[PDB]
């Protein structure tokens, strides 16, 4: 979790959100993912409680409930690699990936 992206492997929890401008993806109470001002939803209300939003090794967005079941998949697939779901400022949620380049300020020059 880091404000406007969810990297693959990260989890957006109940009440957790991604914000860019007048835009807000909330992982809501009723297991519904609503992208406010974005006219979009997972459209999975009440289909769970205590749910969680995840991104796969393959760049798919998945929602599981409190129990453990997949409740929505984005259905899109690409290769094994790193991915970022990002809140574009136009108001879309986009899954980018896989990683194609890395700058590492921890290992030396």
């Amino acid at each position: 979790l880091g404000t406007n992206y969810l990297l693959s492997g990260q989890t957006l929890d109940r009440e957790g959100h991604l914000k860019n401008g007048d835009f807000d993806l909330v992982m809501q109470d009723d297991c519904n993912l609503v992208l406010y001002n974005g006219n979009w939803q997972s459209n999975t209300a009440n289909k769970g409680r205590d749910c969680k939003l995840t991104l796969t090794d393959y760049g798919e967005l998945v929602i599981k409930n409190g129990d453990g079941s997949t409740v929505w998949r984005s259905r899109a697939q690409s290769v094994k690699g790193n991915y970022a779901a990002v809140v574009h400022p136009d108001g879309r949620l986009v899954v980018f990936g896989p990683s194609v380049f890395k700058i590492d300020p921890w290992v030396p020059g």
Binding site: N82, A84, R92, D104
Partner: protein, 112 residues
């Protein structure tokens, strides 16, 4: 054009003249001296292209290439990482990594 977000650079946008990505404890700055420098980290990063050119600017394209051009469009530096043609982004992540993800495989709705 595309509105700015301090930690992203989508294919198309162009930083120059000490423009920068800013995240948590880091900055990746396309400086005035034609050197692209990530600040912070344990060691940080540069492309060492200091003085190599005038009025240089940075731009991630739609093939996944993040490039530095000078005012005459001479390549000064490439991320040298061309891949599938589509929409790319460069995140300066909160963990310090500048990473280029792409292309785009899924959306809530289309651009225009």
């Amino acid at each position: 054009n595309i509105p700015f977000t301090n930690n992203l650079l989508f294919s198309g946008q162009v930083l120059y003249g000490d423009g920068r990505l800013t995240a948590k404890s880091h900055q990746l700055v396309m400086q005035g001296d034609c050197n692209l420098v990530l600040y912070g980290g344990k060691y940080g990063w540069q492309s060492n292209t200091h003085g190599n050119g005038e009025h240089c600017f940075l731009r991630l394209n739609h093939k996944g290439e993040l490039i530095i051009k000078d005012d005459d469009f001479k390549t000064i530096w490439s991320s040298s990482s061309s891949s599938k043609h589509g929409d790319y982004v460069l995140i300066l992540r909160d963990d310090g990594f500048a990473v280029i993800y792409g292309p785009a495989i899924w959306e809530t709705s289309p651009q225009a």
